[PDB]
Amino acid sequence: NPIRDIQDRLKTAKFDNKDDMMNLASSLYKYEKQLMDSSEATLCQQGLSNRPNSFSQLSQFRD
Amino acid sequence: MTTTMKISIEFLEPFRMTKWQESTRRNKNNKEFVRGQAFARWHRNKKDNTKGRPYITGTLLRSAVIRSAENLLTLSDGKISEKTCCPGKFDTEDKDRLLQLRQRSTLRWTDKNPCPDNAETYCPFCELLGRSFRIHFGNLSLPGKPDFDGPKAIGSQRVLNRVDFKSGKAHDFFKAYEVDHTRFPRFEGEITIDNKVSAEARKLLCDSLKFTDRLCGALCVIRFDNLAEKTAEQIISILDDNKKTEYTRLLADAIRSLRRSSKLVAGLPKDHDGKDDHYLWDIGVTIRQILTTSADTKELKNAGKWREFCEKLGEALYLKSKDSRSVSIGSVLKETVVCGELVAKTPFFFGAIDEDAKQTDLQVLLTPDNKYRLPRSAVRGILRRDLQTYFDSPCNAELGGRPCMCKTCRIMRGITVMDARSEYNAPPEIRHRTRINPFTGTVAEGALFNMEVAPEGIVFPFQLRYRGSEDGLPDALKTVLKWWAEGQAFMSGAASTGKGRFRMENAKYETLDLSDENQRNDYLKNWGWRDEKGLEELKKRLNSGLPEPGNYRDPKWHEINVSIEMASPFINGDPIRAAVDKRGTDVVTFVKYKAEGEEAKPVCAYKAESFRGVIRSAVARIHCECLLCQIFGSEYEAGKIRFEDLVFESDPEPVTFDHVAIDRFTGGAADKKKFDDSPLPGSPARPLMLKGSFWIRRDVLEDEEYCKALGKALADVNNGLYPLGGKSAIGYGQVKSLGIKGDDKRISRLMNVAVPEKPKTDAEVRIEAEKVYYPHYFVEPHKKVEREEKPCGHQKFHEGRLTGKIRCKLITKTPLIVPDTSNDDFFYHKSYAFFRLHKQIMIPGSELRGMVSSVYETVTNSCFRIFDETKRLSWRMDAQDFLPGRVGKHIQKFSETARVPFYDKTQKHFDILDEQEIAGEKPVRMWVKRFIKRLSLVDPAWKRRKEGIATFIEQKNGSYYFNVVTNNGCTSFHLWHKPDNFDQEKLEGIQNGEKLDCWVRDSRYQKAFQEIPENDPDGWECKEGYLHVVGPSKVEFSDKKGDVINNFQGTLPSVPNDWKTIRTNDFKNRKRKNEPVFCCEDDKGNYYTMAKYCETFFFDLKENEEYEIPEKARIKYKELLRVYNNNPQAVPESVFQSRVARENVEKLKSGDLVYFKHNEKYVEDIVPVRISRTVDDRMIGKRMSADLRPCHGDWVEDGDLSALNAYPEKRLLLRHPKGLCPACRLFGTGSYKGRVRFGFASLENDPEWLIPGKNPGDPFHGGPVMLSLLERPRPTWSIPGSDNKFKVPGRKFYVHHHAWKTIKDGNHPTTGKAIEQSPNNRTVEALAGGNSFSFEIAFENLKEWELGLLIHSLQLEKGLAHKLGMAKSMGFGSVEIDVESVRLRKDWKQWRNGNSEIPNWLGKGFAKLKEWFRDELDFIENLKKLLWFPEGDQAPRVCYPMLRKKDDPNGNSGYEELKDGEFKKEDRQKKLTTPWTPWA
RNA sequence: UUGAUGUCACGGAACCUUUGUUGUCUUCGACAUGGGUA
Ligand SMILES: [Zn+2]
Ligand SMILES: [Zn+2]
Ligand SMILES: [Zn+2]
Ligand SMILES: [Zn+2]
């Protein structure tokens, strides 16, 4: 399940650290690859918590 | 001298060409250049530039001439006329300078020594070779030597691969340029011959030139003597002017689909209600208008031009969207010819990919004239493959080296076949394919691709020539041709999906003997009958039939027939055809085209890809070198089974069915959730048929393990577990049987207690015969919702989970209505009839699915599956903090207001004021008054009671005009005073100079004018401000005479069409002369009453106070204007309407006049008029617990959410953190397939109608019945305020009663008056109680508690019932469900009966409920109370209240006086959540 | 645009792998509308 790890990365993330940036990029890439190749990880049907903060952080990252 | 000889070449086929190379690379070391030397060259004028033309080198022609000369020499005797013609020299010691060397076997006729290297005379052959320039071959260029831009102008490149016989997959390939012969057939050159050459050598040269038959890889005969880009930019700019950007790919696909005919643009689909507002074709100028203009343009009228235009439009839009041995043989030789036709029995696919066409992944091969092609390379490869299969020996050869000597190669070095093309030239069709994720049961991420396919029925010409030393054709070739004639010819690619089956028809053959002299000299004269006239002459000398081989080996593939029985609707999706078909539906079935002559023929069928996927999935779930790989192939090996499209026997025509989603809270249709689909009809009475076949190798058939796997899978498919098609959740694609013929019973061999009663109900409800109850209440949910993170996958039959069938029976307790909405004029006044299919009364499975889901979600405390989260609520104000102001970044403020008459016959402000200042653009100077003085000449002997002295002047028409110096000289003023009896009679004779006392009172009087009236010329300031004209808007129209209009004298006046020229007719209070009222007359309205005569005037404008505007206030104002604009109950005449609704204002603008309320810093709300609406700041989804909202819902928080579009992680912001609730786990969601399937219901006995029909001889049709009005549900009644204490109550449920008796009688249920026919009400055909229906439910991988709770929700208890159909508030549609049988599955072979486990399942369900909620179960009791069915000797009275009590003859209350009573805003929720609460 | 005593390139199938599928009861009652009086 990469969703929990992404949640952990996000809640701990701060954008001044290239370490944090590369860790979050790796987690998102790991989730993307698991989405492309079919596997048992696709049965995880949940989402993230703290929607406003998560939206702000994701928008800041992908932009 | 050196007399020459002109030559020419006429190409009968496309020829090949080599690309240009740099000078230094043209050497023996380069591999590609050495691989050339047999194809045509390309010229370059300048080395950097690509300009030039093709040409052919003379050395190649010299080699061909030499080869033919040797062939003739070994053939006849080696004697040209009478000379020996020595074998010649082909060896030298200096092999370093040559570029190529001979690798074939040189031929032999004599055993003598070759002639000396230097001698007196040479033989004719040695003269032909030369070795002393006796003969000089010239290069051949073209007629006239034109020039071309580059090689791509005359030809196109193509890829040619080499396969492995063991597996059937390619591993290497090479490229080449191909040039069509219809465009460049002729070449010319010359040959130089010296005078010393012998006449025998000349005759040999002539014979050899006539004998040469192939050059540059083609047959030859030798003889000697703008709007697209513009329209694309227009359409793209239009889509960008809108925000319809997601539809670009779909639009490009539809445009490319339109290429077939321009007439399809005229017959394009439109939107519902007959209006041109399609969500694709009317995005705008509009796309439809543009396509019509491009269609009717003259230059694009041409068919081919239209086709090219459409293809270029599609390409542009898709781009934007993405953005030496010397061995003898002998003199024996024969030449055998075979002719025939190769007809296509299925579609075919010859792959050929173009670099400048990216939209389609897989493309077919075509000529520059758009004709289909059958390449020589493919025919040769298939012949080689069949020969290798016949000999059962692969050829282990390699490129280069000496020639091979195996039987296949020896047979293949005698073969010649001709390239072919067809007359049919219509465009190819397109097919779409997907990949399914086996875990979730939905498509994978990004697994979509296209495929181009050619139609079936095309006929090609066929010609094959064999040259060998045998008496006739080899036995292997005879057997291969017999296989091809039978229909075992698989030529094209994609054979697994059923492409490329051809048959050979009308075969003829003849043998020629080129050993006989006369026959040889006749062959040479006629050039071998290669040209068209020679071919016709040869065809006049051909015998029919074909030979018969001795050693006949049977074919390798065996046919297996298939027949399927289907008793339900079927559909196979095709969105593009739905996007261009004229029917106007959301989903359409699949249809293919058969090529007959030059015209197509539509036919519906089932896709071979879909069938293959279904069978593969069935095989893989009950069981690299694994079985699946071995049988179905993989990416490293070819398959061993080939499917085909299945067709229907007696061609059906599609129907249409409509659907709608119901909101759980309001109980009405959810917005933007109305859709329909077009399946083929099917039913048990006249089921559908399917026919087809599939092919399988014999080796697989002779394998017991593979036959066992196939038999198991087909048995599972036969036992209703795997439906065919889509939308299986609502009873589509239910297979009933499946046959398999033509296998010798190798695969077909494997394919071959009563229920307990319900428990009684303990629920009790007290009903009194005098009170009146409400027709619906609510059920309050629980606080906790259980969610599981890992649902059960679909990849296997898990152990510990159950699978099988459930059979039920449905009974009607009250009359039922289920209409057929295809026809709305069965009997303006709409009419409907009962649902039917092939003249059989039925109920669709979607209705039953929704009905059962509504109760299951209540039993298992789950989320609100269907709910409009983004709706915003509004409420009317009632007659303080709203202050005037003007708009921008901040808003201005005013301190006070004042009224200005505009609709009375006293002021006449229209004659004076300008239009701009009426609109409020310019300032105006007006005259405000704040207080008025009211005398009473005698002492009160009032509330304030001031004092003074009056000074009489005169007495006018009655009245009393006089100046009054109050407080003994302090203040003075004039006025008019009426006679007050008991005080006025003291002064009836006036003196004109007499003074009397007076007491004055003050009253608030805030008005403004521009010229002071005649009555009050004193005490009037002059201040500046703006005006707020809104027009006549206060109006009170109704059905008939009220009370004020009843007192009107005479006929009321006419209507003015303008909003300015209205004036008052009559005052309401005639005595006091106040409350002006206006009335007017129109044709059918006849009743308008306007009670407004003053406007508003602001003043005291300030400059300091400034308040920022928020976006929340902005969106609230937008919703306010939308609510004003969309009002069904609006007054008809626009003159009686406010400005915002008359002029149709949409957005806020600067400089407008509006009221507002503010906090310390920002503004909170804005309204256009004094008494207006209030709009909630929060959406309806935020007024409920987060655990009750849908698991996969919509965005409610502040944010566009569009920045994260086109990224993967955006989907995680719309899902709950804790997973899925039980309802979404069972019934499925948008990214998870369900585990239950419902089926269509059918009536068992003969129908029983509510009203007898007009014809006694037609018992299958019933009479009509008229219903009352049916209006929308209103959330505002349940949520009567904006305060945070109000929340969503719960799920709505309707109660059971017998109000339908009054409607059947014909009277209104509430008032008892007769029902009025009108365009608004409806007429329906209804069935009576006592009828019975039967249906079936199928589940898969369910737990004990899930199955038990499902059975409970089906058959709850005795004394309870469900609600089905329409008119539920009137008592229609109470039904009861009882279970009949419960089958189960153990293995593929055994299916037991599970009727003796229902008590255990029910107990486990109750235990799970107890262990989820610790024995509270209040919602359970509430639900059981609401589902209670009244028993005998109990007739509750249930109906809605009227708007007012005067409209109710029964004397019961109405809504207006009920709001100020029991149902006030503080206890409304409590009184609505309690079931069976009386209100009268 | 060729060399000359040597050309099996008709000496080589663009081939092989992927279900247009998933989720939705043709359903239904409380208003609308801005002022007026002193
Ligand atoms: Zn010689
Ligand atoms: Zn070989
Ligand atoms: Zn495998
Ligand atoms: Zn849910």
Author numbering:
A (entry chain B): 3 to 65
B (entry chain A): 1 to 132, 146 to 238, 260 to 318, 327 to 365, 392 to 691, 706 to 834, 842 to 916, 930 to 981, ...
Question: Could you share sentences copied from the article?
Answer:
The type III-E CRISPR-Cas system is a newly identified bifunctional complex with nuclease activity and protease activity that holds great potential for RNA editing applications. Here, we report cryo-electron microscopy (cryo-EM) structures of Desulfonema ishimotonii (Di) Cas7-11-crRNA, complexed with or without the full length or the N-terminus of TPR-CHAT. The Cas7 domains, arranged in a row, form a crescent-shaped filament, with the INS and CTE domain completing the structure. The Cas11 domain is positioned at the crescent’s midpoint, and interacts with Cas7.2 and Cas7.3.
The truncated TPR-CHAT containing only the NTD can independently interact with the complex at the same position. When the DiCas7-11-crRNA complex bound to DiTPR-CHAT or DiTPR-CHATNTD, the conformation of the DiCas7-11-crRNA complex was unchanged. The enhanced stability of Cas7.4 (V1317-R1336) is attributed to the formation of numerous interactions with DiTPR-CHATNTD. These interactions include a pair of salt bridges formed between Cas7.4 E1330 and TPR-CHATNTD R64, four pairs of hydrogen bonds formed between Cas7.4 L1333 and TPR-CHATNTD L50, Cas7.4 L1334, and TPR-CHATNTD R53, and Cas7.4 E1330 and TPR-CHATNTD R64 (two pairs), and dozens of pairs of nonbonded contacts. In contrast, the mutations of the NTD residues Q47A and G49A that formed hydrogen bonds with S1352 and H1337, respectively, outside of the segment of V1317-R1336 in Cas7.4 neither affected the formation of the complex nor the inhibitory activity of DiTPR-CHATNTD. We found that the affinity of the DiCas7-11-crRNA complex to the target RNA was reduced by the presence of full length (F) or NTD of DiTPR-CHAT but unaffected by the CTD. The regulatory characterization of DiTPR-CHATNTD by preventing target RNA binding to Cas protein is similar to anti-CRISPR proteins (Acrs). However, it is noteworthy that the activity of DiTPR-CHATNTD has only been demonstrated in vitro, and whether it can exert a similar inhibitory effect in vivo, particularly in mammalian cells, requires further study.
